[PDB]
């Protein structure tokens, strides 16, 4: 597995003011409606709004993004293992993830504290897409 190399970060800035679920720290967040698979969600965020990529959360943004959820629904996020360690997002950095099984598909939920791993990511879940505000 590798990152598909044509779905990179956004060097531009736009977020639609009408239909976004919540905002924090100068980012406009989007919960998708069509439950894609995990590998496809790199395309799904880049085809929803311009200057928008698939995202993985940082431990300060995390309690807000889980508080705007229901009790049952889940949500893919954007961390992976391109090598043999150091779970990183597309934005860069490191995280900490409750691991059980392996390959490169990670979700959150309501009672979750960090991102947590998943076993068969042929399943269909909504995805999380972000975009920076006008200050950048």
């Amino acid at each position, epitope marked *: 597995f590798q990152v598909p190399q044509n779905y990179t970060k956004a060097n531009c800035t736009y977020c639609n003011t009408r239909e976004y679920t919540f905002s*924090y720290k100068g980012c406009c967040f989007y919960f998708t409606k069509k439950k894609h698979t995990w590998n496809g969600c790199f395309q799904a965020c880049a085809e929803l709004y311009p200057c928008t990529y698939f995202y993985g959360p940082t*431990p*300060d943004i995390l309690p807000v993004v889980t508080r705007n959820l229901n009790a049952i629904e889940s949500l893919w996020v954007g961390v992976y293992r391109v090598g043999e360690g150091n779970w990183t997002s597309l934005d860069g950095g490191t995280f900490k993830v409750y691991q059980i099984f392996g390959s490169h598909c990670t979700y959150v939920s309501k009672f979750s504290t960090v991102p947590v791993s998943h076993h068969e990511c042929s399943f269909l879940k909504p995805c999380l897409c972000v975009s920076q505000r006008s200050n950048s």
Partner: antibody
Amino acid sequence: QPVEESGGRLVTPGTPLTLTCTVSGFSLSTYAMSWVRQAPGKGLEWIGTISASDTTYFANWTKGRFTISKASTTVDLKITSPTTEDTATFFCARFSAYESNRDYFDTFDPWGPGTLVTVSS
Amino acid sequence: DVVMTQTPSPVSAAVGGTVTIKCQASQNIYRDLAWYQQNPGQPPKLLIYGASNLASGVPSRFSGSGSGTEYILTISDLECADAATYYCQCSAYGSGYAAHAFGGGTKVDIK
């Protein structure tokens, strides 16, 4: 008692100075603390911020002087070199995230009592 | 970064009335303000956040609003206790960095 500070002394400048603010009743790994200087007879000005993770930032007027350490149950402030201008009281804050509809703003909701820091030779 | 300007010092009115106080900014911060008060010898306490929304536990008589770079904080049904200073606070976030600011506001009654 959400947050309480400690460490006020009086000293001539140059000398190494540290304070801390202890927390209770939640986790400091999920929230983020900050610092703010209030000179006696003045307003406020924001010093710095230790995040949920270990990354941090400061205001531009601070020249690398104020630096912040995160501990197991407290947050440690480390001052390199005070001057006579640095004499103030310091307040340890907490970034709480309340909400309007579809928005989430960022406020210093709980404020500690603070401790007077002083310079008189 | 962002710099703020507020009203000058001497603000008062009659006991039990309505007093306004305005905080103007430099650049656009997208309805992100906060208002704090401190009794002399006391820490700040949150009053109105999000530039238009009441906090939890503050009485309903307060009202602040506005848009753009200039905003208002208005009182209704003044109390002899509510006589101390009042601050305004913004927060602008960059792409990677983050910053904050404050201002200098003064007491609101003796008459």
